[PDB]
Design a binder for this molecule. Structure first.
Ligand SMILES: Nc1ncnc2c1ncn2[C@@H]1O[C@H](COP(=O)(O)OP(=O)(O)OC[C@H]2O[C@@H](O)[C@H](O)[C@@H]2O)[C@@H](O)[C@H]1O
Ligand SMILES: Nc1ncnc2c1ncn2[C@@H]1O[C@H](COP(=O)(O)OP(=O)(O)OC[C@H]2O[C@@H](O)[C@H](O)[C@@H]2O)[C@@H](O)[C@H]1O
Ligand SMILES: [Fe+2]
Ligand SMILES: [Fe+2]
Ligand SMILES: [Zn+2]
Ligand SMILES: [Zn+2]
Lengths: 384, 385
């Protein structure tokens, strides 16, 4: 009956937050870090923002930049080998959800060698030891991987993304610095931003929701809905707001769950390598309409913080307004509205739906989804 | 510029939350606990609620119940000795702020022996190693000692309570279980509940306040103001609400600070052993009035979440409403309104004011307080002013 909360024991927030990293490392006595990131972040100079500071403080580090969007089992094994050989005693994840999840997988397996095949970590990972210490530095404003206890890896052999949930993978310190995120192309800010909004909305209405997560989630929705357009536009302060909002969303959903949006988005990532946030964005409003009757007064709350004047509006009208506010936001930030626009094939829907039905996140959906329900949702999101 | 947040990596909430303790211990591989608590909690059977579960799970434990309200350096040293002689490898704090703070001191000194004098830990403790692992189980709905990075010890020799701030003392796991709090006498629920409200209000307007702590604090105020009366009355759900509210308050103030209410309350605890919550309760409304002009629109938010329909009043009226709401709550839960009622002496005011001026928490007050200002505030709280 009791509710558990897993959070970062230490976290730094604000532009310039990464400047606290060298002092945190020194106070922990670590000797060498393995930075887990990708080639784009190295090319854009984002990784240098961190290594330059580390060099100035005389802190040793090595880099693994083989991470690819929607990280695969192959990437995890490659990164793991690099880490084991490096002799590093801690990990620094620099990037969005892909590098951060890869980093979590590496840290967990390094101290829990029984899960060497990686795929065995799906669900509530029965690990016995904490991951190698992880210092997380997000570069996107959407996944909250720095504070959640989950990470998703793509099993290419079985063509499916599997979510791993494990308190042992929580980063020891997170640095939420908007300076690390400004380089995101506007389209990326939009996709990861709606991914964050999806986290907050699904988390707010998830089956396991309770007082504390509801408070975190509704604040996150308000912050995100109020700052996303401005951030996509390039506004500096909105970018900092988004950095906080996406993190606050994570403080909640990591501890209670999500729903059918993520359950349906994962198979798309596995089948087409579709960007996670774009998949969530397209599916979100449709899944919300589907869940409407099972959400109490919560859609009135969502609509209210998304700019809609809900006073004197019926619950039915408020629910329609919440869904429309999301459709509107997606249009405003430029995300394609139909699944056909992003490479999905109708012939694959039966398999995608079954995959969605079996996805870890689907169980938290307020409405118990059937196979045909999911098939219908994919077809509805196909072209409107 | 950047803001730091220290929180419990793991925490369990709700009635029955202590039931998660044995599993958490096993998952961490600890071999023997030293339970830090007091004689009342042992007598009332509260400690047994935990040890019975531990016995059934086959987990070893030893107990130190010598903690006294407003824990002293002597109690810390005695408890440290018991810990060292027990063979325990972790600590379980069962109780209110006194046992929890004593436990933090013990856990820190054990891994940082150069601070054996205890008093040298005041302020931002320059400790190099994390405290011995602490699993915290609060029994009062007010201090949030289970999630904050502070602890206050009484220096009997120098007659003063000193606050210690250190990320190294954060408990590894917190179990917030109202079943552990139901035994609180109504007056204790009242006092500890206003202590929690003070935490939320001071934290909401403190100098270092920012977006995240403001969100936590205003939510804590709403929760506490809405449930305290019912909890004092004995309502079970209200007690569960208070358990959450007092904790949420801590998630915030531990990371930004408090103010003059706590700065003035501490010297009273050192001078008269006045219960912390009672001191804060009497001082709170007066200090709020003092800080009014340096809190922006925040008193409007406080008044609103405390049941006041601020719908059409001005900022000046909203600010008065917030203060009155606190005066009303204190009356409703039966806390004395005047410092004279609880054993304070006017002759001690100059000394109390100086102590308050030097208290760690005072620096966070939104209004720079002078010695003269503090003297005036004590006199005002004396008999209403
Ligand atoms: N600040 C940045 N500036 C420029 N490019 C960036 C930045 N941050 C990330 N990128 C680039 O954006 C692309 C996508 O990065 P991801 O990490 O894959 O995206 P994100 O949304 O953060 O995470 C997605 C992943 O997290 C999981 O929850 C989800 O299932 C998916 O696997 C990559 O090419 C990456 O280099
Ligand atoms: N559930 C309970 N049932 C009955 N009595 C209880 C309970 N919990 C605590 N008590 C009793 O209440 C008295 C006060 O307990 P404290 O721990 O001293 O009170 P609390 O308000 O929780 O903490 C105060 C301490 O914290 C610091 O922030 C403050 O400076 C002070 O030293 C003691 O006699 C204690 O045994
Ligand atoms: Fe999930
Ligand atoms: Fe303080
Ligand atoms: Zn997501
Ligand atoms: Zn207090």
């Amino acid at each position: 009956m009791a509710n558990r909360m897993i959070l970062n024991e230490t976290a730094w927030f604000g532009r310039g937050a990464v400047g606290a990293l060298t002092d945190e490392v020194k106070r922990r006595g670590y000797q060498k870090a393995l930075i887990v990131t990708d080639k784009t972040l190295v090319q854009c100079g984002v990784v240098a923002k961190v290594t330059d500071k580390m060099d100035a403080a005389g802190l040793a580090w090595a880099i693994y930049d083989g991470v690819v969007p929607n990280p695969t089992i192959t990437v995890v094994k490659e990164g793991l080998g690099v880490f084991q050989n490096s002799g590093a005693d801690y990990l620094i994840a620099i990037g969005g959800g892909s590098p951060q999840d890869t980093c979590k997988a590496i840290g967990i397996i390094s101290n829990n060698p029984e899960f060497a095949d990686v795929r065995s970590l799906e669900g509530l990972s029965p690990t016995n030891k904490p991951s190698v210490p992880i210092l997380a530095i997000p570069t996107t404003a959407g996944t909250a991987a720095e504070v959640t206890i989950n990470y998703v890896i793509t099993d290419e052999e079985k063509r499916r993304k599997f979510v791993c949930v494990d308190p042992h993978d929580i980063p020891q310190v997170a640095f939420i610095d908007a300076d690390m995120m400004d380089g995101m192309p506007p389209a990326l800010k939009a996709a990861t931003g709606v991914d964050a909004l999806t986290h907050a909305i699904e988390g707010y209405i998830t089956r396991g929701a309770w007082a504390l997560t509801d408070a975190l989630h509704i604040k996150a929705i308000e912050i995100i809905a109020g700052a996303l357009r401005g951030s996509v536009a390039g506004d500096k302060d909105a970018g900092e707001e988004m950095a906080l909002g996406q993190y606050v969303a994570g403080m909640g959903f990591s501890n209670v769950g999500l729903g059918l949006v993520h359950g349906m988005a994962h198979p798309l990532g596995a089948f087409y390598n579709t960007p996670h946030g774009v998949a969530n964005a397209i599916l979100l409003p449709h899944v919300m309409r589907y869940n409407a009757d099972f959400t109490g007064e919560k859609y009135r709350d969502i609509a209210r913080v998304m700019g809609v004047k809900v006073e004197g509006m019926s619950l039915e009208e408020a629910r329609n307004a919440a869904v429309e506010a999301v459709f509107a936001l997606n249009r405003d930030v430029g995300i394609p509205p139909h699944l056909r626009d992003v490479g999905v094939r109708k012939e694959d829907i039966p398999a995608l739906a079954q995959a969605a039905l079996d996805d870890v996140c689907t169980g938290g959906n307020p409405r118990e989804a059937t196979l045909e329900d999911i098939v219908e949702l994919y077809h509805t999101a196909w072209e409107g």
